[PDB]
Design a protein that fits this description.
2 copies of one chain form a homodimer.
Chain A lengths: L1 E5 L3 H15 L5 E4 L5 E4 L1 H7 L2 H8 L2 E2 L2 E3 L6 H13 L1 E5 L3 H11 L2 H7 L4
Helix pairs in contact in A: 5-6
PDB class: transcription
Keywords: Architectural protein, chromosome, transcription
Assembly: dimeric
């Protein structure tokens, strides 16, 4: 018969490995480019777990030298904290950015982040 | 100052999404081909969290029509349960395959699976 054995807390194991890959830019397959020409390299599948907005950007925005040109309303001030949230489950932000991050999560329909920003008690 | 808020159990959230992608072959970037010409589509980054063996296969094995030709000793009988383990943390196997799976994890140096197959009490 079929047996099964398991490693507990697989999600924690896997996230640690994935975060390391992100930090070292290993296996990244999407390069985001900001107005100042700086870049952030990411994993498409990580972004896609939370949202389809990056899918729509890839369908509708210019690609220059293998980098996706981010829209004017979606620059590093919101992108960097949101991407770090997608890799970790933690959103780090200054309060002054709360409303901008909420409007950005609403534009993305990023439900999991909306729920977090709107959490209470 | 910098604030932080979090979604608990992010690993569990993320794994559910990743497993769905695997089941639907969304964002897959590596196609494994068996001797019988059947294929298994996977995510390179998931495989890489557990092992570098697939990295070495990509460096050393033939690619035909966008698929990596698996070696004779590394066919679906061991590959399918090992890949499912990489996505889930659970290894499902018939006892008759225990030694073959252990020898395969040793060839791959897949430490996390070695530890599981060798676990006690």
């Amino acid at each position: 018969e079929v047996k099964s054995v398991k490693v507990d807390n697989w999600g924690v194991f896997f996230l640690q490995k994935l975060q390391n890959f992100f930090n070292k830019t290993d296996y990244c397959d999407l390069t985001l480019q900001f107005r100042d020409n700086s870049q952030l390299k990411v994993h498409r599948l990580v972004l896609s777990a939370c949202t389809d907005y990056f899918n729509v950007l890839e369908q509708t925005c210019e690609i220059v030298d293998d980098a996706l040109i981010m829209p004017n309303e979606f620059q590093a001030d919101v992108v960097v904290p949101i991407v770090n949230f997608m890799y970790t489950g933690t959103l780090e932000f200054e309060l002054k950015m709360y409303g901008k991050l909420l409007r950005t999560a609403k534009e993305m329909n990023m439900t999991v982040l909306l729920k977090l920003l709107e959490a209470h008690r």
